[PDB]
């Protein structure tokens, strides 16, 4: 099965990439027990620039064509206890994102689920929470609420909701 991201404008096929990582914000407050909720970063370019893993291309939510890790996915933060600090997630095995030009970009659902399972186990480890929930962006300007990216000097805005809508136990 295939996960899709609608995009405006329509990304050309040569704008296909490998997702090599991503950045997220942890919802704060006393947790509803015993769950931690994670969304694509509520921050901005500053957060992304400090991650040190973004690479050449300028993107939000997902890192494109960036660096990878050795054997396992590694999450990193300036301070995991601080909900105002974003969590930088570096994949070890990249996930292809095929753009078609029809208007949407696609990724393997099995491969992303396999990826999300690994991220969840690392987060579950760092925070100790039994369950991990990925949810869409809390809000923000168009460039951040969506997975947005610069290819060939053109800005593309892709709805990443199908990427971030699962619960892990």
């Amino acid at each position, epitope marked *: 099965d295939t996960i899709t991201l609608p995009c405006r404008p329509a990304p050309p096929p040569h704008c296909s990439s490998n997702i090599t990582g991503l950045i997220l914000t942890r919802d704060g407050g006393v947790s509803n027990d015993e769950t931690e909720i994670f969304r694509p970063s509520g921050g901005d370019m500053r957060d992304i620039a400090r991650c040190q893993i973004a690479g050449t291309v300028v993107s939000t939510q997902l890192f494109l064509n960036g660096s990878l890790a050795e054997e396992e996915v590694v999450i990193r933060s300036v301070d995991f206890r601080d909900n*105002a600090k974003s969590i930088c997630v570096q994949l070890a095995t990249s996930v292809e994102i095929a753009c078609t030009g029809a208007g949407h970009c696609a990724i393997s659902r099995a491969k992303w689920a396999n990826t999300l399972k690994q991220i969840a186990s690392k987060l579950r480890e760092q925070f100790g929470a039994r369950t991990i929930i990925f949810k869409q962006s809390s*809000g923000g300007d168009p460039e951040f609420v969506t997975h947005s990216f610069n290819c060939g000097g053109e800005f593309f805005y892709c709805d990443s909701t199908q990427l971030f809508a699962s619960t892990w136990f």
Partner: antibody
Amino acid sequence: QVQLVQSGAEVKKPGASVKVSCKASGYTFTGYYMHWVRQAPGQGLEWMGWINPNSGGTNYAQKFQGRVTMTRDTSISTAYMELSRLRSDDTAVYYCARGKNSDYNWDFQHWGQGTLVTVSS
Amino acid sequence: EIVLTQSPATLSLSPGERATLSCRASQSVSSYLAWYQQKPGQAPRLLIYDASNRATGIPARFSGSGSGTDFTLTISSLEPEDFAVYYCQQYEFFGQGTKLEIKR
């Protein structure tokens, strides 16, 4: 010369919604996150959420997800906090607040005068 | 949740004595804490940040220190303006408060 000025007290029936504004001045608005913190009468301080004024990105406390919406208008240096579906235990003084520093930004050096919001019937 | 337990609930002292408030954090993050002072009908005011640094316009009688899980706010020679409620903060969590009144 940092000043935070909030809108006036309001009286609201249950089920209704309230929007509280916060005009910021004396610093570069986009440089700091704006927080909202409420205080019920006779009780302590409870954090509601922050808004990144540069991106409009937000982080709300889990107990407020689905009912709170924070936005800002950088054009006029004003942040907004909207609380919908009001109930009686939402009666509180609501404060906008800003960290003293930008790194660890949770030491609230600056506060508005606070907006009293009474939920009715 | 980071649970912060302040001590004591009420502190009864006289103008000139040494006040000592404490705050225990249910973790180990020991370099970040804030202390506020609050008076009736007024916004809270920052007194101490980073466990031990004075905020804006804060006289030298106020100080703070951090013993790992434990943190303390110290008020040498209490003035009558110093009598109020005091909350401690770490990230988005606050303490339940300690009230400091005149002992009579």
